[PDB]
Amino acid sequence: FLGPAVIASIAYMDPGNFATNIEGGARYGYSLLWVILAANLMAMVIQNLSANLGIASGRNLPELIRERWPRPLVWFYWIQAELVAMATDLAEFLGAALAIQLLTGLPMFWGAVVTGVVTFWLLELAVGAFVLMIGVAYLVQVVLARPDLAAVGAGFVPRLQGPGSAYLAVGIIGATVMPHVIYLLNRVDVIAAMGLAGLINMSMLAVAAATFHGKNVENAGDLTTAYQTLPAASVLFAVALLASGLSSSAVGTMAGDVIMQGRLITMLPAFIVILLGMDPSSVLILSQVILCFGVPFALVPLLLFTAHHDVMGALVTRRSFTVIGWVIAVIIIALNGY
């Protein structure tokens, strides 16, 4: 319908999910699609538990964690959440820089200046039409190859152990369960939005795995080589990226104002790109595992606050196993990070 589709295209609209559902297809092919499944399901749990708690004993999570926790722990959770929104804005400026260099070819510094003056410009239907049009653009090839061979033969979970194998999956599932959706008639619109746009992500990844897996060539991490051919569809990919970044800017920075009030300070990572010693293309995926490390700190308070003062949320089945599986995975990739 016209509601959940726009709510979905806007709901994802970040460079991180583009830049990790196009790495999983270039290295771990269809065998990674499953995580995207697990990426949405628990997420559709979590936000529901936020909608299940956001009206009863009404307050956003930053208002709650200031009510009954020690002060040093409040400073620690503000370090954690501020590094979370900081890393999200790093994702915004990075992806928008790669987009501006993907269009006019401007250096990422001048691209960051243009994103600064677009932050000046911020003070809708066309953006959702761009992410909707690239979303249908990846629904052009959601049909395209071996529907029962590589697909369902890889949606069943593999226990792969390698550093990059679990690192990239942790980046994907750490980018989908965005920490700022946890800081929050309505349930159906979001279950269908995240539902269909889950097909946008499985489409993006599967097409990223069928477009070139065994072909080798230049890696898909740059996103400059991510323009798939059916000419103008490439510029459509770059404009879709730029729109996704510029909108995730306002949404994630206003959300950072919600977590922060209860501007340029998050722009310091935005110019770490000038370090020149390492290329930015794949520090965005890291930007989604660091963002992943800020998820348990955003999940424990919901899990514990859900069952005291309020009705509903008595179910503690999958919603509590997901946090311990989550933390054991991120402690696998964190305890092997040396």
Partner: antibody
Framework: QVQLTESGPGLVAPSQSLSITCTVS????????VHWVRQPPGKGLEWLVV???????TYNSALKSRLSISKDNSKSQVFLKMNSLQTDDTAMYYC????????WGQGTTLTVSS | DIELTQSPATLSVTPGDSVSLSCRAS??????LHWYQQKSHESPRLLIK???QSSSGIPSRFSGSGSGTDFTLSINSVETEDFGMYFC?????????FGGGTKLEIKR
């Protein structure tokens, strides 16, 4: 200088087993997928199988359930292996790996007759 | 399951006149195709990636031209060092499929 080299030629009886060593040099084997290409004495060739690094074997339907592909990153060797009955498939085998292809091995001769 | 019929099967040239190999497809495969030269008892170095971009370390004599369901390699002034086999490989979909091949020969 990027370079691939293979195992020495082999002559085996029918219903025997065999293996071939496609060892690599000059590139990061753990970062590239190796394809196998079989050329009979002069009767064209068709794509065989691909082993993506970290063990990901995909066999074609033509040569499935007979061939197997081991990998050893410790010495960066890509092992080809044939067991079962041998039914005198006799050919020179090839391996390939580089972002656009174009770095193939010298090939290895393999003859089967009793 | 896509195939690639390659014609002509064998080709004679003086050398001097330009030759043009045809690698007809079974269905559309986009610009996913590879051109290889080969000599007797040798490993085939890559010539043409994607039918348009000439591959790394390849003389400007060769040029691939084509679009869609069929593609053609073309050599101008054969130069006595382009004789022998030529193979053609799609790479878009499993299984990868090589062409019928051609053996270029000297003509007199």
């Amino acid at each position: 200088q990027v370079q691939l080299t293979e195992s020495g030629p082999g002559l085996v009886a029918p219903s025997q087993s065999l293996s071939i060593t496609c060892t690599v040099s000059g590139f990061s084997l753990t970062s590239y997928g190796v394809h196998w290409v079989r050329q009979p004495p002069g009767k064209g060739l068709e794509w065989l199988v691909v082993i993506w690094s970290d063990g990901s074997t995909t066999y074609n339907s033509a040569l499935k359930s007979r061939l197997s592909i081991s990998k050893d990153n410790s010495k960066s060797q890509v092992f080809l292996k044939m067991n079962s009955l041998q039914t005198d498939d006799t050919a020179m085998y090839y391996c390939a790996r580089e972002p656009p292809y174009g770095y193939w091995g010298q090939g290895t001769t393999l003859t089967v007759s009793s | 399951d896509i195939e690639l019929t390659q014609s002509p099967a064998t080709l004679s040239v003086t050398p001097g006149d330009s030759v043009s190999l045809s690698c007809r497809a079974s269905q559309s495969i986009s610009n996913n195709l590879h051109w290889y030269q080969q000599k007797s008892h040798e490993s085939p170095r890559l010539l043409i990636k994607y039918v348009s971009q000439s591959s790394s370390g390849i003389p400007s004599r060769f040029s691939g031209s084509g679009s869609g369901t069929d593609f053609t390699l073309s050599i101008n002034s054969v130069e006595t060092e382009d004789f022998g086999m030529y193979f053609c490989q799609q790479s878009n979909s499993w299984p990868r499929t090589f062409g019928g091949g051609t053996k270029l020969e000297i003509k007199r």
